[PDB]
Write a protein that binds this ligand. Structure first.
Ligand SMILES: [Ca+2]
Ligand SMILES: [Ca+2]
Ligand SMILES: [Ca+2]
Ligand SMILES: [Ca+2]
Ligand SMILES: [Ca+2]
Ligand SMILES: [Ca+2]
Ligand SMILES: [Mg+2]
Ligand SMILES: [Mg+2]
Ligand code: NA
Ligand code: NA
Ligand code: NA
Ligand code: NA
Ligand code: NA
Ligand code: NA
Lengths: 510, 510
């Protein structure tokens, strides 16, 4: 269907003949520069390539306010997620309306020139409540307060070039490009599938049934910008998509990556996804259970109800101009060797099997088997590689502050001991000297599968620098992972405690 | 580089706003229609999509003659293979210059309107000698005399649509389309690889080295129109390409299909391939040993010298405007587990292994093993499927005219006997009654793996209707595949002769 607002605002194409001129202005000595944050790069790419039609810049306060309370742009155009350029006070003060500023990437690549319409300090409590529902634990609110700038700069954009990406150049289709790809194949009915996760047999099955019921071709449009915190990296995920797309019948599916920065804003985001896919050329879209929802908070309560998304999108059905296909999740029937829509089988009368994310995570952590009815083997092989089991995981042993035995000798004892065991893990007694440049290397070593022995703890005002994954404290204190019987426990006893701890946790296997 | 002649003659785009008008004219009652032959569909698709720039129609006699003797269009543009619309006398007579005729596909799909410039009867002996070197066994000369019409119609083309194809819609990129695909990936150095065969490890290796030496991305551009007689079907081949393209390092290669009708015209064709790839957007091209050559004739003599192609292309180097990368064939070194350029190793000092086409064919016929150093397993699996070994091959036993035993009983005996054996082959006593509609089904059954028992021979004026592959004559005559001791040999003896013959030939395995 036609782009939201009727026109594809592909600013790259619009400004093609001003590229040199704009590029030269961006590189002028007198122009004020702003370095785009990683989320802003995600947003500006979608504005510049028309992914966010009718947007043609970051929202000024007039539009922003309507989006916050009315879920629309001041002109009444449905638009549920505010896209603004958040800056700090120091920069906001240097700019006034009509000021033209340059937006760079990595402090070296000019992306666009923004003509300032306004500068304002939004009430983040209202946005937090109105747009994201108010739970301080909602990733969007966390970002809203802890990362986002306190001042929004609204203004019209002029394009120099889209944010630079060196990976998957072939798959990052812009709206215009994707539309031409469909057009060259004569596809005029396309159902799009959103995801920020690996795809298993069930996803393959459900998307194909969608294709069959909507009489449409399939578009697997995964998000590769910012997704939920803790999600699997997009490189791993792209590898999985590239693998699963080969499992569809020839000529029925197309894989294209979307550099979107999700807010995990549930029902509002679901609407936004529909609009965005319409701009990219899809005729149909599937909205899932708790679509774009971040789940439950600490108190175990739902950030959104499982059907809020589908209900909200349905309420805007008459103006979305993109058909929404009903979400029919499928489950595996052992006794019939097939998948079937969950709404068609009687739980208490028919056998069904499925592997929850929690269980999948466990199996991967212990190197256990994962059945082909759940996920294709080539897909599982990829997941095991990016997330190796414990015998292949790195780790660190931190000699606590309470230790009175010789740190130099205990570290040497641990090294010599670990080195006896096989498995190929690399070991290092690592001294950081409380230097940040060294502390930041700890998780890289662990990520590399290495075993580090750290002679002493770093200062508390440095915790933030070190990731806590697979990092274990050896100390007399109660908060120690490997508790010492006493501060002067004999080195050989300590060594045993560590070895058996690592064994119990799967790092060593004999 | 720029299209040959400087302009991409994409007539589909040129005539976009006349499509309805032209379509309506093509469907008029008074317009004279011509049904395009399968080769003409191959040629018109390349003319219409700019693949043959600067051509904009089929060659008139003025241009055709220059191509025949001068290897150029009358304007002096390098062009080595004549592309003409060959028709029979009955049609040629109905047309005069300025006559507008419609060119259809399958007698139902209008492709273009041709404005006749001239009608002429070419001297096919000169073309045969000058363009194709004169050997009556050259596939182009065979076609030239036995299939091609005796009258050439020269004229300008106007596009309605490209020849319809329902398979691989995604991979059939036109010149403009491919150029945009390279442009979107920022590829400006692309080396193209021509082929009408399956690709094995050696081809993968040599194309990647080409990429490394030319500092270019790779374009695997296989021909899927008409290639050499006896070649493997393009469906099988496309399956292989789609498989091998996955073996290149990510982002280095692109697969696009070329609907060219090869003439197997060696050095002239090599030049033509360079021009064509330049039009499709390649900056580089590899010309191989005996490139586009059909091999040797009956007397075992070479249709072309192995380096005629490379030498001819090199002589036109200063006007081709596309770099030709030297052809460095590679061979496998067992002792080093690697492939290396054949021009770098000493045959008598270093071990090298390779599997000729003949040997590959044998292994496939007997279901023998084919090593991974030769071809990737997923590629070999595909070849085995399209070309199954003898235990999975169909066949036919024809009861010769010399037989005096009861044909009804011998056929029944053979059936009952074959049915004892396992293997899943399907059997049928097939009566054709000398009817063409039934005879043409024989190879379909054999192609399906079936075993047919044919009670009597068909008339000689029908031989042509039946393919001779895996068809065996049971007769007393000397020209019989399974020779009877006598015309009245006992049925049980005959049955044994047939069973043991089929066993010796691998159809049955116990
Ligand atoms: Ca703040
Ligand atoms: Ca719930
Ligand atoms: Ca003590
Ligand atoms: Ca003739
Ligand atoms: Ca030779
Ligand atoms: Ca007798
Ligand atoms: Mg980009
Ligand atoms: Mg076509
Ligand atoms: Na519409
Ligand atoms: Na999913
Ligand atoms: Na609710
Ligand atoms: Na040039
Ligand atoms: Na080849
Ligand atoms: Na020669």
């Amino acid at each position: 269907p036609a782009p939201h607002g009727g026109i594809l605002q592909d600013l790259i194409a619009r400004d093609a003949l001003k590229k040199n001129e704009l590029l030269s202005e961006a590189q002028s000595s007198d122009i004020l520069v702003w370095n785009l944050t990683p989320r802003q790069l995600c947003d500006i790419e979608l504005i510049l390539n028309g992914g966010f039609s009718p947007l043609t810049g970051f929202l000024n306060e007039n539009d922003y306010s309507s989006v916050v309370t009315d879920s629309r742009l001041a002109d009444g155009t449905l638009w549920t997620i505010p896209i603004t350029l958040d800056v700090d006070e120091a920069f906001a003060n240097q700019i006034k309306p009509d000021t033209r500023i340059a937006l760079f990437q990595d402090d070296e690549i000019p992306i666009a020139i923004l003509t300032v319409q306004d500068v304002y300090k939004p009430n983040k409590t209202i946005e937090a409540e109105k747009v994201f529902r108010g739970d301080p634990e909602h990733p969007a609110i966390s970002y809203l307060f802890n990362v986002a700038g306190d001042y929004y700069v609204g203004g019209s954009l002029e394009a120099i070039q889209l944010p630079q990406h060196y990976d998957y150049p072939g798959l990052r289709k812009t709206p215009a490009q994707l539309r031409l790809e469909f057009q060259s194949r004569q596809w005029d009915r396309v159902v799009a599938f959103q995801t920020r996760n690996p795809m298993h047999r069930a996803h393959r099955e459900l998307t194909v049934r969608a294709a069959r019921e909507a009489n449409a071709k399939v578009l697997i449009h995964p998000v590769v910008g910012l997704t939920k915190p803790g999600d699997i990296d997009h490189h791993t995920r792209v590898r999985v998509y590239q693998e699963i797309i080969k499992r569809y019948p020839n000529g029925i599916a197309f894989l294209s990556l979307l550099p979107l920065a999700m807010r995990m804003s549930g029902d509002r985001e679901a609407v936004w996804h529909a609009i965005i896919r319409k701009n990219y050329g899809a005729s149909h879209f599937i909205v899932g259970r708790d679509h774009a929802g971040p789940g439950k908070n600490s108190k175990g309560v739902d950030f959104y109800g499982p059907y809020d998304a589908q209900e909200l999108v349905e309420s805007y059905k008459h103006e979305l101009d993109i058909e929404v296909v009903p979400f029919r999740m499928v489950t595996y029937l052992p006794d019939e060797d097939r998948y079937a829509p969950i709404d068609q089988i009687d739980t208490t009368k028919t056998r069904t099997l499925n592997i929850s994310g929690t269980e999948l995570r466990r199996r991967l952590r212990v190197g256990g088997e994962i059945p082909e009815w759940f996920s294709y083997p080539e897909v599982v092989k990829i997941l095991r590689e990016s997330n190796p089991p414990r015998p292949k995981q790195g780790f660190s042993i931190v000699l606590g502050n309470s230790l009175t035995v010789s740190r130099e000798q205990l570290s040497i004892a641990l090294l010599s001991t670990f080195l006896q065991f096989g498995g190929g893990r690399y070991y290092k007694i690592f001294e950081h000297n409380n230097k940040t440049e060294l502390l930041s290397l700890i998780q890289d070593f662990i990520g590399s599968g290495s075993g580090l022995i750290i002679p002493n703890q770093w200062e508390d005002d440095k915790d933030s620098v070190v990731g806590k994954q697979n990092v274990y404290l050896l100390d007399t204190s109660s908060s120690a992972d490997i508790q010492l019987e006493s501060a002067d426990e004999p080195i050989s006893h300590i060594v045993q405690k560590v070895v058996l701890f690592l064994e119990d946790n799967g790092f060593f296997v004999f």
